[PDB]
Amino acid sequence: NIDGYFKIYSKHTPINLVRDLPQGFSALEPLVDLPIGINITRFQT
Amino acid sequence: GNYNYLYRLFRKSNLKPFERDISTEIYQAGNTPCNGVKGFNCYFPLQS
Numbered sequence A: 001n002i003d004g005y006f007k008i009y010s011k012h013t014p015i016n017l018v019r020d021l022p023q024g025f026s027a028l029e030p031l032v033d034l035p036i037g038i039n040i041t042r043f044q045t
Numbered sequence B: 001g002n003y004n005y006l007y008r009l010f011r012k013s014n015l016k017p018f019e020r021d022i023s024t025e026i027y028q029a030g031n032t033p034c035n036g037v038k039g040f041n042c043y044f045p046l047q048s
Helices: none
Strands: A006-010 A029-034
Touching: none
Parallel strands: none
Antiparallel strands: A006 A029
């Protein structure tokens, strides 16, 4: 959040692993950019 | 009287550009810590 801009970048990657992060380099393209402009301090899944 | 346009009278620190402050808690302008809603050196943060 820079000046309240809630930036969302995601990518799908087919992998074959069991317990660890994939070995390699992966990017993230912009899915959506949100100008929400609200105060954020703590999150939850 | 157009008293509806309230405004903050005090502030603990100089706020940032495009920063919005709505909380109306009583400011502790005095040396001593303060609580409650009223008291000397304990003034309403907003004026009209």
